[PDB]
Design a protein around this ligand. Structure first.
Ligand SMILES: *[C@@H]1O[C@H](CO)[C@@H](O[C@@H]2O[C@H](CO)[C@@H](O[C@@H]3O[C@H](CO[C@H]4O[C@H](CO)[C@@H](O)[C@H](O)[C@@H]4O)[C@@H](O)[C@H](O[C@H]4O[C@H](CO)[C@@H](O)[C@H](O)[C@@H]4O)[C@@H]3O)[C@H](O)[C@H]2NC(C)=O)[C@H](O)[C@H]1NC(C)=O
Ligand SMILES: *[C@@H]1O[C@H](CO)[C@@H](O[C@@H]2O[C@H](CO)[C@@H](O[C@@H]3O[C@H](CO[C@H]4O[C@H](CO)[C@@H](O)[C@H](O)[C@@H]4O)[C@@H](O)[C@H](O[C@H]4O[C@H](CO)[C@@H](O)[C@H](O)[C@@H]4O)[C@@H]3O)[C@H](O)[C@H]2NC(C)=O)[C@H](O)[C@H]1NC(C)=O
Ligand SMILES: *[C@@H]1O[C@H](CO)[C@@H](O[C@@H]2O[C@H](CO)[C@@H](O[C@@H]3O[C@H](CO)[C@@H](O)[C@H](O)[C@@H]3O)[C@H](O)[C@H]2NC(C)=O)[C@H](O)[C@H]1NC(C)=O
Ligand SMILES: *[C@@H]1O[C@H](CO)[C@@H](O[C@@H]2O[C@H](CO)[C@@H](O[C@@H]3O[C@H](CO)[C@@H](O)[C@H](O)[C@@H]3O)[C@H](O)[C@H]2NC(C)=O)[C@H](O)[C@H]1NC(C)=O
Ligand SMILES: *[C@@H]1O[C@H](CO)[C@@H](O[C@@H]2O[C@H](CO)[C@@H](O[C@@H]3O[C@H](CO)[C@@H](O)[C@H](O)[C@@H]3O)[C@H](O)[C@H]2NC(C)=O)[C@H](O)[C@H]1NC(C)=O
Ligand SMILES: *[C@@H]1O[C@H](CO)[C@@H](O[C@@H]2O[C@H](CO)[C@@H](O[C@@H]3O[C@H](CO)[C@@H](O)[C@H](O)[C@@H]3O)[C@H](O)[C@H]2NC(C)=O)[C@H](O)[C@H]1NC(C)=O
Ligand SMILES: *[C@@H]1O[C@H](CO)[C@@H](O[C@@H]2O[C@H](CO)[C@@H](O[C@@H]3O[C@H](CO)[C@@H](O)[C@H](O)[C@@H]3O)[C@H](O)[C@H]2NC(C)=O)[C@H](O)[C@H]1NC(C)=O
Ligand SMILES: *[C@@H]1O[C@H](CO)[C@@H](O[C@@H]2O[C@H](CO)[C@@H](O)[C@H](O)[C@H]2NC(C)=O)[C@H](O)[C@H]1NC(C)=O
Ligand SMILES: *[C@@H]1O[C@H](CO)[C@@H](O[C@@H]2O[C@H](CO)[C@@H](O)[C@H](O)[C@H]2NC(C)=O)[C@H](O)[C@H]1NC(C)=O
Ligand SMILES: *[C@@H]1O[C@H](CO)[C@@H](O[C@@H]2O[C@H](CO)[C@@H](O)[C@H](O)[C@H]2NC(C)=O)[C@H](O)[C@H]1NC(C)=O
Ligand SMILES: *[C@@H]1O[C@H](CO)[C@@H](O[C@@H]2O[C@H](CO)[C@@H](O)[C@H](O)[C@H]2NC(C)=O)[C@H](O)[C@H]1NC(C)=O
Ligand SMILES: *[C@@H]1O[C@H](CO)[C@@H](O[C@@H]2O[C@H](CO)[C@@H](O)[C@H](O)[C@H]2NC(C)=O)[C@H](O)[C@H]1NC(C)=O
Ligand SMILES: *[C@@H]1O[C@H](CO)[C@@H](O)[C@H](O)[C@H]1NC(C)=O
Ligand SMILES: *[C@@H]1O[C@H](CO)[C@@H](O)[C@H](O)[C@H]1NC(C)=O
Ligand SMILES: *[C@@H]1O[C@H](CO)[C@@H](O)[C@H](O)[C@H]1NC(C)=O
Ligand SMILES: *[C@@H]1O[C@H](CO)[C@@H](O)[C@H](O)[C@H]1NC(C)=O
Ligand SMILES: *[C@@H]1O[C@H](CO)[C@@H](O)[C@H](O)[C@H]1NC(C)=O
Ligand SMILES: *[C@@H]1O[C@H](CO)[C@@H](O)[C@H](O)[C@H]1NC(C)=O
Ligand SMILES: *[C@@H]1O[C@H](CO)[C@@H](O)[C@H](O)[C@H]1NC(C)=O
Ligand SMILES: *[C@@H]1O[C@H](CO)[C@@H](O)[C@H](O)[C@H]1NC(C)=O
Ligand SMILES: *[C@@H]1O[C@H](CO)[C@@H](O)[C@H](O)[C@H]1NC(C)=O
Ligand SMILES: *[C@@H]1O[C@H](CO)[C@@H](O)[C@H](O)[C@H]1NC(C)=O
Ligand SMILES: *[C@@H]1O[C@H](CO)[C@@H](O)[C@H](O)[C@H]1NC(C)=O
Ligand SMILES: *[C@@H]1O[C@H](CO)[C@@H](O)[C@H](O)[C@H]1NC(C)=O
Ligand SMILES: *[C@@H]1O[C@H](CO)[C@@H](O)[C@H](O)[C@H]1NC(C)=O
Lengths: 122, 451, 122, 122, 48, 48
């Protein structure tokens, strides 16, 4: 396995290794083109970390969260969504389910943030 | 029984996005010390052994007509082309009236009105002093004005320089690589008609060498097919768009310049030098090209049957040769050692096909000033080349255009097109599609975050 | 509430939400100007993380620390500094108290760093 | 002590303070030169964090790991490698031992990653 | 309102903007034709 | 180029008497050896 060497494989096996998919993520007319691409590439990498940073995890890259999960979003059993369906198909199924899952994570984590500070005093 | 939601980072998923690429040069190219066009000085060196790997259990859609790679590449070539002519001589003061006549040195009648001998008043390295020099000019580079007076066609239009004398126009194969966070998906399916599912898709960091050949029709030094010659088209039924077809077997080409030319150095100004053709040494002949009859007919006979599938089994196919196009879309344009050839093509598309060794030689003409990437506002002058040129290359593809919608006639004629540079590179980047990787991922999982 | 939608409000309510203030923090003559601004903007964002990274926290954005706190610096009761005073007024009050609070955090965290490693062996 | 003020000193004392070595790490013809250097400098800083991020630590900058350690690599007692030998000499001794120590860390951490998620369910 | 830096000092200008917009008419009743003159190859100059 | 220039009177209003001038000059053509002259109208403030 290498760079995206299991993208089309079952998501169960794909989740086994993730660093391989994250290694090759950061690494005079033409000078402008080279500089422009480099800045754009690094900018995207920092954006993802900022999105993950505000949550209850920094670099664990497996971020268990206690937020609820609506049943209507998936309406399917756990068994079928971890053995055969590939990741590419899953993304298309949640195309409309964007900008709303993130909101739940942020509001819950921030709400629990104060609850994780008051207890320290007593 | 309850399940909550977690997130996954680095999950492999791709989308569509617009982005630019950069150079990748091999070690062999780096060996050359000449800073010519498409040089390695401004292009980063590549890396050997690309990590090309296969992909399984995945289906990807591909498109070659809407691909953005060709569009940006077209702008890239012209951008670098202008930079090559900037830092050296300017040819603005060449416009001078010419009292010019013919020239006859045992010249063949087949090239009667093509060469002219005459002189003009040109400024020397100084200013007060004046001197005159003579040179030979081609027929297409001189127009008629009004007992006899001639002038260049470059004077009543924009003015340009000459090809810089310290660079070479020989094509160099370069590799295109996307920046970090973007990959390239390559389609290796044997059957690939441009648009459709591509179950056999493989990713690669960088692509193989692509030669930016200069040609309008009958592109040279292209990527050869493997088997079951295919036809590339967008709508087929609509004749407005061209048809791109590449055949399997390579058919060689011979194109020589039997005329011997000498270069004369003329001092225009201080530090400015202009090269002009001098006297001809030896006999006066005409440039031509040869193609093997057996190879050419066999290729046509092998491709004609293939095209019948799209239209019909009982379809009569005839080939035409086009007509006048101001020497823009009516010739086979190619370059050999810095010399541009615009030559005849009627000797190839002249056959008809029914439902059920010797070589072809064609005369033609050569002109110095050209308009490649037409760019009304600019041009370029072709310097003379010492000795003779004998270039050998291959033909890998053809450009065809359908006729009008007359009626339901089995007699269908295909005619060569050309003139569009975007179509030239579409035959080399039809297997590629840039992608946008999104590491973020969401999926339900039975886990709890302790407090 | 939106981008700096509670800057002038009481600091008690401002501390309730912080991600909103951190969202819009990262996102041919003119080409030079655009590139220069982008590099400068991203550079500042990384500087803050580096300052926070060396401490005992990465992205929690509420970083409880055990370093002492001099009474003379504030000389005020806790009640009054959490209900009415706005954040802008607080910053002006600690204008002179800069480059010295950070030093305490770094020295203490590093000192406790070794103390948090020796115990692992035994 | 200042910027690399103890590089040649004993590694035991050098490990006492590390932030000082990490502070000065991030901070029209000439415009191109200035921009090119800045992008290159920041790019290296992010690369190190990405290498450290995938492991079981984000910014602790003392990352204890449970991966094994081959005896043949060092073949020396612990006492002598913590009192006199300087860091510069140590780096030369592990010049060949590169790209293989990192592999052990990644494979072990990822393997334990799933083991640290299954237990949450039960 | 009236915009000024020091008012008392006359060295600096005074910027004043009023509320109601007052329209302006400015026409060119003379009819002019352009003549294309060839200066050089690719260079053109327009003259009245 | 030097201008041997004079006034122009085509039922011109006296309020714009000395404002328009008609004249020509020697200007280079698209070629170099050949020469030609053209005429145009210039404003008062553009001529010294
Ligand atoms: C690309 O190549 C094609 C090849 O077909 C060119 O088309 C030919 O061009 C030539 C040159 O102009 C044409 O030749 C002329 O055709 C006329 C008739 O010639 C034919 O018929 C006569 C009998 O009527 C035969 O004797 C002859 O062999 C041909 O079969 C005449 O107008 C011309 O006669 C010339 O020669 C005599 C001397 O013999 C002179 O007295 C005449 O004044 C005159 O100069 C001449 O033969 C030819 O017809 C074209 N077609 C074909 C099918 O060959 C394209 O022009 C070329 N395109 C470009 C852009 O280069
Ligand atoms: C399509 O692909 C074909 C096949 O590869 C190409 O044809 C080759 O073209 C190259 C490039 O021109 C040929 O390689 C070399 O070309 C040079 C010819 O021009 C030289 O001449 C002047 C003379 O002063 C020099 O100043 C100028 O810089 C050029 O260098 C020569 O360099 C080479 O010949 C000399 O060196 C070789 C060794 O390299 C000796 O063997 C020769 O005797 C001689 O001393 C050489 O020819 C190559 O030969 C062509 N044919 C091949 C490879 O079969 C097409 O160019 C390419 N493009 C198109 C549009 O079809
Ligand atoms: C490459 O080949 C594929 C497979 O033959 C072509 O796809 C087919 O395209 C034709 C012509 O447009 C489609 O015909 C019509 O399509 C729709 C329904 O999709 C409808 O008008 C008719 O019922 C009829 O089928 C055909 O559906 C379509 N087939 C598939 C499976 O997509 C494709 O167009 C070819 N591409 C090129 C560039 O030639
Ligand atoms: C590929 O080319 C064909 C042929 O041009 C395209 O089909 C053509 O589509 C046009 C535009 O809709 C049709 O024009 C109209 O058709 C009818 C019959 O005349 C009527 O509505 C109007 O008078 C007008 O002419 C045209 O008929 C139709 N021709 C056909 C089907 O033979 C087709 O859309 C093109 N495909 C792509 C993918 O571009
Ligand atoms: C262009 O002209 C060249 C030069 O004549 C042609 O290629 C040459 O073809 C001859 C004849 O086949 C080759 O020599 C002989 O070939 C065979 C090899 O089995 C055999 O008769 C002899 O042993 C001898 O080698 C010659 O090597 C070859 N030269 C080159 C440079 O390829 C060519 O076919 C013509 N047409 C094109 C390129 O379209
Ligand atoms: C706004 O403009 C006023 C008027 O110029 C400025 O006040 C003026 O300040 C100058 C510089 O200090 C004074 O010059 C000196 O004043 C006295 C009386 O003559 C004496 O020390 C010297 O002989 C010299 O002239 C000037 O008198 C004074 N004028 C007044 C107060 O009427 C004022 O500073 C300006 N404000 C700002 C914000 O720029
Ligand atoms: C500049 O000249 C124009 C054109 O005369 C002046 O504006 C024009 O004013 C007339 C007279 O009011 C407008 O037509 C009439 O206006 C009133 C509307 O209540 C009424 O008498 C009639 O029903 C008729 O519409 C005309 O529309 C208007 N034209 C424009 C383009 O605004 C203008 O006042 C002059 N002075 C400036 C602009 O300072
Ligand atoms: C140069 O050769 C030409 C071609 O033989 C002579 O006359 C040409 O005749 C054709 C007939 O169609 C005319 O259209 C051309 O304009 C002529 N060419 C010219 C004027 O250059 C011509 O007389 C010969 N010129 C000289 C000076 O001998
Ligand atoms: C082009 O014409 C020029 C003259 O206009 C020819 O130059 C002559 O060359 C001969 C032979 O060497 C000399 O005897 C003459 O003195 C030259 N004349 C001048 C004016 O210098 C030249 O040879 C012609 N070129 C061709 C290819 O015919
Ligand atoms: C292209 O074909 C032409 C036409 O056959 C060749 O020209 C002949 O070349 C031979 C060489 O020995 C001469 O003897 C003949 O007189 C030429 N004329 C004819 C009509 O055959 C030409 O050499 C070929 N070019 C190449 C590069 O192979
Ligand atoms: C050839 O194409 C023509 C033009 O489309 C067809 O002509 C039509 O024929 C049908 C037959 O039912 C008539 O109803 C239409 O009025 C005709 N339309 C015209 C002339 O515009 C013709 O049918 C086609 N031939 C075949 C064999 O398909
Ligand atoms: C052009 O008109 C002017 C104005 O009537 C004539 O004389 C001008 O008189 C004023 C008087 O102050 C002088 O200052 C100007 O220099 C004069 N203008 C010139 C010389 O252009 C003038 O005579 C008229 N020119 C012609 C050629 O008729
Ligand atoms: C879950 O989705 C359903 C259907 O849209 C909606 O009615 C319900 O309010 C959602 N539940 C929560 C807790 O958001
Ligand atoms: C998303 O929802 C829209 C309607 O809001 C629908 O048209 C579209 O098909 C949906 N997309 C997917 C991928 O299901
Ligand atoms: C043919 O013309 C050429 C032109 O260069 C000349 O050198 C040669 O001597 C001529 N041959 C004859 C036989 O006149
Ligand atoms: C210019 O060239 C002509 C011939 O074209 C010649 O007669 C004349 O002497 C040369 N010199 C000048 C100053 O025109
Ligand atoms: C062309 O002329 C030069 C003169 O030096 C000669 O060396 C060369 O061999 C000639 N070329 C041909 C092809 O006859
Ligand atoms: C090409 O070959 C076919 C048979 O395959 C023959 O009918 C045809 O005449 C040939 N064409 C030429 C131009 O020789
Ligand atoms: C043409 O194709 C052949 C295929 O073997 C290749 O070797 C050759 O380099 C290509 N070019 C020429 C000029 O033959
Ligand atoms: C607290 O501040 C006072 C007043 O400046 C100073 O004397 C004292 O040493 C400080 N205490 C500590 C522990 O730094
Ligand atoms: C900071 O202290 C200086 C004296 O060191 C004083 O002048 C200044 O006003 C103080 N700033 C604030 C904001 O209190
Ligand atoms: C340790 O190194 C030795 C010597 O190279 C090697 O034989 C052995 O397999 C290594 N052990 C492990 C666990 O990798
Ligand atoms: C690394 O190993 C090579 C042989 O693989 C050896 O030549 C070299 O000296 C070694 N380097 C060090 C620093 O020991
Ligand atoms: C100016 O002259 C042109 C000449 O074509 C004429 O069409 C136009 O109406 C004239 N303009 C005025 C305002 O009289
Ligand atoms: C230049 O213009 C003048 C008038 O200003 C005219 O008499 C003359 O013939 C023109 N030509 C030259 C060469 O001066």
């Amino acid at each position: 396995l290498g760079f995206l060497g299991a993208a089309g494989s079952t998501m169960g096996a794909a989740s086994m290794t993730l660093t391989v998919q994250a290694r090759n993520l950061l690494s005079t007319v033409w000078g402008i083109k080279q500089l422009q691409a480099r800045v754009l590439a690094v900018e995207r990498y920092l954006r993802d970390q900022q999105l993950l940073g505000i949550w209850g995890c920094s670099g664990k890259l497996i971020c268990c969260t206690n937020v609820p999960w609506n049943s209507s979003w998936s309406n399917r059993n756990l068994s079928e969504i971890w053995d055969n369906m590939t990741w590419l198909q899953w993304d298309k199924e949640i195309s409309n389910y964007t900008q709303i899952i993130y909101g739940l994570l942020e509001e819950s984590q921030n709400q629990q943030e104060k609850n994780e500070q008051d207890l320290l005093a007593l | 029984e309850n399940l909550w939601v977690t997130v996954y980072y680095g999950v492999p998923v791709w989308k569509d996005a617009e982005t630019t690429l950069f150079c990748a040069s091999d070690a062999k190219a780096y060996e050359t010390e000449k800073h010519n066009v498409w040089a390695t000085h401004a292009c980063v060196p590549t890396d050997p052994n690309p990590q090309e790997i296969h992909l399984e259990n995945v289906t990807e859609e591909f498109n070659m007509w809407k691909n953005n790679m060709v569009e940006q590449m077209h702008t890239d070539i012209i951008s670098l082309w202008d930079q090559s002519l900037k830092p050296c001589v300017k040819l603005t003061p060449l416009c001078v009236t010419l009292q010019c006549t013919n020239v006859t040195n045992n010249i063949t009648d087949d090239m009667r009105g093509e060469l002219k001998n005459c002189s003009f008043n040109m400024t020397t390295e100084l200013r007060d002093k004046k001197q005159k020099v003579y040179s030979l000019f081609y027929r297409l580079d001189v127009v008629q004005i009004n007992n006899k007076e001639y002038r260049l066609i470059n004077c009543n239009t924009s003015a340009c320089t000459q090809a810089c004398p310290k660079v070479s126009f020989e094509p160099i194969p370069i590799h295109y690589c996307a920046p970090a966070g973007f990959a390239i998906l390559k389609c290796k399916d044997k059957k690939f008609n441009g648009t459709g599912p591509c179950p056999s898709v493989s990713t690669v960091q960088c692509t193989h060498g692509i030669k930016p050949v200069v040609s309008t029709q009958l592109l040279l030094n292209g990527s050869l097919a493997e088997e079951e010659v295919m036809i590339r088209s967008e709508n087929i039924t609509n004749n407005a768009k061209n048809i791109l077809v590449q055949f399997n077997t390579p058919v060689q080409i011979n194109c020589t310049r039997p005329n011997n030319n000498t270069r004369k150095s003329i001092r225009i100004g201080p530090g400015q030098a202009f090269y002009a053709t001098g006297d001809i040494i030896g006999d006066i002949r005409q440039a031509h090209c040869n193609v093997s009859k057996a190879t050419w007919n066999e290729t046509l006979g092998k491709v004609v049957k293939q095209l019948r599938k799209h239209f019909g089994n009982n379809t009569i196919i005839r080939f035409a040769n086009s007509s006048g196009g101001d020497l823009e879309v009516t010739t086979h344009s190619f370059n050999c050692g810095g010399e541009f050839f615009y030559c005849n093509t009627s000797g190839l598309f002249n056959s008809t096909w029914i439902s059920n060794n010797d070589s072809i030689t064609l005369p033609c003409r050569i002109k110095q000033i050209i308009n490649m990437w037409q760019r009304i506002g600019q041009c370029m002058y072709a310097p003379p080349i010492q000795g003779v040129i004998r270039c050998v290359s291959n033909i890998t593809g053809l450009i065809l255009t359908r006729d009008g919608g007359s009626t339901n006639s089995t007699t269908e004629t295909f005619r060569p097109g050309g003139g569009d540079m975007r179509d030239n590179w579409r035959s080399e980047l039809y297997k590629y599609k840039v992608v946008k990787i999104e590491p973020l991922g969401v999926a339900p999982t039975r886990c709890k975050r302790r407090v």
